[PDB]
Amino acid sequence: KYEITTIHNLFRKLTHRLFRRNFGYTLR
């Protein structure tokens, strides 16, 4: 339950807003 089910809570901003500026995809 870390993929997205809960990731949405850890997401810095929203989902893909600025998840490519410094931290690409930490959910992987």
Curated annotation (Swiss-Prot):
Highest taxon of source: Eukaryota
Ranges for region Glycosaminoglycan-binding site: 1-21
Disulfide bonds: none
Tissue expression: Expressed predominantly in liver. Also present in plasma.
PTM description: Phosphorylated by FAM20C in the extracellular medium.
Function according to Swiss-Prot or TrEMBL: Thrombin inhibitor activated by the glycosaminoglycans, heparin or dermatan sulfate. In the presence of the latter, HC-II becomes the predominant thrombin inhibitor in place of antithrombin III (AT-III). Also inhibits chymotrypsin, but in a glycosaminoglycan-independent manner. Peptides at the N-terminal of HC-II have chemotactic activity for both monocytes and neutrophils.
Disease connection: Thrombophilia due to heparin cofactor 2 deficiency: A hemostatic disorder characterized by a tendency to recurrent thrombosis.
Family membership noted in the UniProt record: Belongs to the serpin family.
Entry note about domains: The N-terminal acidic repeat region mediates, in part, the glycosaminoglycan-accelerated thrombin inhibition.
Protein name stated in the entry: Heparin cofactor 2
